Design a protein around this ligand. Structure first.
Ligand SMILES: CC1(C)[C@@H](OC(=O)CCC(=O)O)CC[C@]2(C)[C@H]3C(=O)C=C4[C@@H]5C[C@@](C)(C(=O)O)CC[C@]5(C)CC[C@@]4(C)[C@]3(C)CC[C@@H]12
Ligand SMILES: CC1(C)[C@@H](OC(=O)CCC(=O)O)CC[C@]2(C)[C@H]3C(=O)C=C4[C@@H]5C[C@@](C)(C(=O)O)CC[C@]5(C)CC[C@@]4(C)[C@]3(C)CC[C@@H]12
Ligand SMILES: CC1(C)[C@@H](OC(=O)CCC(=O)O)CC[C@]2(C)[C@H]3C(=O)C=C4[C@@H]5C[C@@](C)(C(=O)O)CC[C@]5(C)CC[C@@]4(C)[C@]3(C)CC[C@@H]12
Ligand SMILES: CC1(C)[C@@H](OC(=O)CCC(=O)O)CC[C@]2(C)[C@H]3C(=O)C=C4[C@@H]5C[C@@](C)(C(=O)O)CC[C@]5(C)CC[C@@]4(C)[C@]3(C)CC[C@@H]12
Lengths: 253, 253, 253, 253
């Protein structure tokens, strides 16, 4: 079992993967503080989850926004036990063609938003007695994914920040691990023409693209005390994408 | 949470981490076959797990043995959906010190013996339509652990066999992943001088050693369908021993 | 041996290992372009290395400072074949301590800084028939290193960027790799209490720290044509520091 | 730099990688000792390098063979400085397909073989006051390579034996590093239908198969004092095979 009688703040929780993550966690008996910069939906989402949700606005790149939400969650539910740095943005383009400003923007949200997320929540956690900080990274943060430039650098930096942090916080019973989903089906990626459904994606050994229910079960698992001895680790959720080239690619075509 | 309402053979399951994943998974709703070389212990252990547990003598390096336990599982139970490869033997000495004969024996039980398990059981899983192989590797398989010689090489072989098999079985619904515990508290390790408790093992970030219950949960999670997209992955359950040096170390002792 | 009778610009070139890499690249016939921000000391050095080198002021974070340095070399030796992105600043503090402002500051100098160099110098290398990008990183980008926060974070970022740039640039004859030097005895490091010599640094299997000359050789080897088939690679140059814990640590002291 | 004045025993030196590294090593002043099971071809190859080469018939799985050649090296030459474990056979068949006899056989040459090699030479090197052991692994040791069954499980095992040894021996001045070749143009790989040349392998970022002079050079560099601080490392000479998938593969196509 991966149950939860605690409170957790999930970022980028209005739509996408954060929405699912939150859906399952509340299902898991936890109370959730969704946080996004897209109100309309965060409002609805929490409005769907029920009495165990509460949506807050949160511009992940701002420590003020950050401290505000932390307090509010300590204030409302009485504790901050888990975090889910899930907010960020994609970069699909040939590095030579990327602008130094967009670059500065993806890293900012992807990389710093995460750090500002962690050092803020650490005190509320030393308070609880411990915490679980699941940073949602990517398959791209595990191998050199071409065409992800700024997205690539950031996601690899989230991977290292979660490790050093894991080392420093250990004695505090504060775990820090990264999750790395691969090509997962959602409306952002939907605009990428990703053939959803079994066997519809041939460049992953599993032959198919993952769905969010899949990546979310991983987060929750770590959020729980099931994994009371897991810290500074990386869990890829990509149907083998990252393990090695599939057969066809190895055969030479 | 994770539900394993299916069939699983556990290698080395009569004591320690094996028996632990035995009892825990049964609780999870699975039907377990304790395959092990200790008849007396495996008998007692299975005896106490109810009509959900069976004991069958198994020498991991004997292929005849394998085809029996696999056939009995499928006959007696109806099929085989998961295999937890937990059997092996440790090494604690400087490489130049190890006899080539010891070296081969260990690498035989640890690496070759999991190969038979995978090569054998595969046809039982393609049948049922899929399943999960969970190879119990080690912290000695994620970084170079000194003094482990044959066990180091052994376990790294498992991290690798695990991966290649996943890229191969990907599209047959057969899932394979490695599980890498760090200093866990087992009889084999109690002898060593290891002691459980907060602050009892400085040289690992969480300051202590894990118990088997914390490792099994990583296991049940992979066996369960909840991880239906985690293939060719490697999860460490070592309180950060493996993630990077300890603070004290990064500076100086 | 490793020959490089070609031209390369060296970022952070005025001092320490950026100065040693230049001292070496020149010895091997390189037309070296030292580019730092210490105009006064960078002129002393390029002066010292003779008529094989020039000095340019390069603020790594400014897109034009970058285009001018390239344009200077370009219209100076013929082309741009190699590039060593060595400029950066360190971080010695727990994450909870680093301000989000210092965080942005360091990351801007370490990550983006090297990115601006990659896309700026690229067209120069295309018109040169290809070449090699050598991104200096460190043990901090190879494992979770405590007390580095932003430096650990950007260093992992320069690792993941090298690789993605590698797969994208392969066909135009551009090789991208990251060197990963461990505790080396440079200017900034002598102030810590770091003593050079054998026996002096017990927490690395070699029991010593590295003089910059040993780190330089990797730069050059990767800059020469002797490594024509090396791309997306990562070479640790730390005396074993990131391979695994010291035997003493493994046994608990 | 890349100039030897030391004596090095290369294994599998009758033909291929061993043959190339032999030339170059000798070309950099190394007195080399070729070891092979091909008594006819190596004696030929040796006659080529001159009076700085020497052939011996060695069976890697025979410790007695090992103790003999190592004795001979220190007899004709007086010391043993390097070792290049290049012996080992391949595999290219699915897991379930391969026998338990062949597996135990490829493992024993590829893995146990390097083990005796390492265990027999270490003393000859302490006597010498230092040495460099280069174990030749493979891109199959770096990722889960499909159809490489037993060959994978040993290549991954050599990578791990290299690291734990590097640490056990560091303060002794003996470096252990693994090299990782990707699709390299040798006879059988050519007899695999591998069309040599630029652009002839679309499934590797560099778009081609490597040449042996290209893997030889990296072995040469790691064998010298030009990497005195390189221990516990792993270098990959694979044209980007390992960094990550082809742009084409990321787009799918
Ligand atoms: C890891 C996931 C699956 C994704 O995954 C998550 O689940 C997000 C959660 C999160 O962000 O935390 C976030 C971004 C992403 C890294 C993604 C991206 O960035 C942009 C593109 C581009 C689209 C396209 C068609 C074009 O250029 O038009 C072709 C080129 C290119 C580069 C390849 C295909 C994708 C779709 C690419 C690389 C596939 C992998 C992908
Ligand atoms: C892999 C783990 C962490 C452990 O792993 C698990 O618990 C999980 C997986 C599994 O159970 O296989 C199983 C035991 C073990 C292989 C272990 C062992 O055996 C014996 C010794 C020796 C004990 C002792 C007292 C001596 O013998 O002199 C002192 C010297 C010496 C050499 C120190 C190092 C250890 C402690 C050594 C090699 C470290 C790694 C260790
Ligand atoms: C990455 C390397 C190995 C180093 O790397 C190199 O030498 C090669 C690569 C490169 O040059 O970048 C560059 C500097 C450095 C980042 C380094 C640093 O900055 C300052 C300190 C501090 C010194 C001191 C006295 C204090 O300040 O309080 C005591 C506390 C503290 C926090 C302990 C650890 C180190 C030594 C710390 C963070 C460890 C990692 C270290
Ligand atoms: C590790 C390297 C890259 C190689 O490495 C080197 O080139 C030397 C350097 C080193 O030592 O790694 C040694 C051979 C090998 C492991 C190799 C092999 O064994 C046989 C085949 C077969 C060729 C072919 C056409 C068939 O004939 O059926 C189709 C099916 C099949 C199974 C797949 C592709 C390869 C070519 C396969 C598995 C790809 C990986 C390959």
């Amino acid at each position: 079992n991966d149950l939860s009688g605690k409170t957790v703040i999930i970022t980028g929780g209005a739509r996408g993967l954060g929405a699912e993550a939150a859906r399952q966690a509340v299902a898991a008996g936890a109370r959730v503080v969704l946080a996004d910069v897209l109100d309309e939906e965060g409002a609805a989402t929490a409005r769907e989850l029920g009495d165990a949700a509460r949506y807050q606005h949160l511009d992940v790149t701002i420590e003020e926004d950050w401290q505000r939400v932390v307090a509010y969650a300590r204030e409302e539910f009485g504790s901050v036990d888990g975090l889910v740095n899930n907010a960020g943005i994609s970069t699909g383009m040939f590095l030579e063609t990327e602008s130094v400003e967009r670059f500065r923007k993806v890293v900012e949200i992807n990389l710093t938003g995460v750090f500002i997320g962690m050092k803020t929540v650490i005190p509320a956690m030393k308070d609880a007695g411990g915490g679980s900080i699941v940073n949602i990274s990517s398959a791209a943060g595990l191998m050199g994914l071409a065409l992800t430039s700024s997205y690539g650098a950031s996601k690899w930096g989230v991977r290292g920040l979660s490790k050093l942090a894991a080392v420093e916080l250990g004695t505090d019973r504060i775990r820090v691990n990264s999750v790395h989903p691969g090509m997962t089906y959602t409306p952002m990626t939907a605009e990428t023409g990703i053939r959803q459904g079994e066997g519809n994606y041939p460049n992953t050994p599993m032959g198919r693209v993952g769905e969010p229910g899949e990546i979310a079960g991983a987060v929750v698992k770590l959020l729980s005390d099931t994994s009371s001895y897991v810290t500074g680790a990386e869990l890829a959720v990509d149907g083998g994408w990252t393990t090695g080239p599939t057969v066809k690619y190895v055969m030479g075509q």
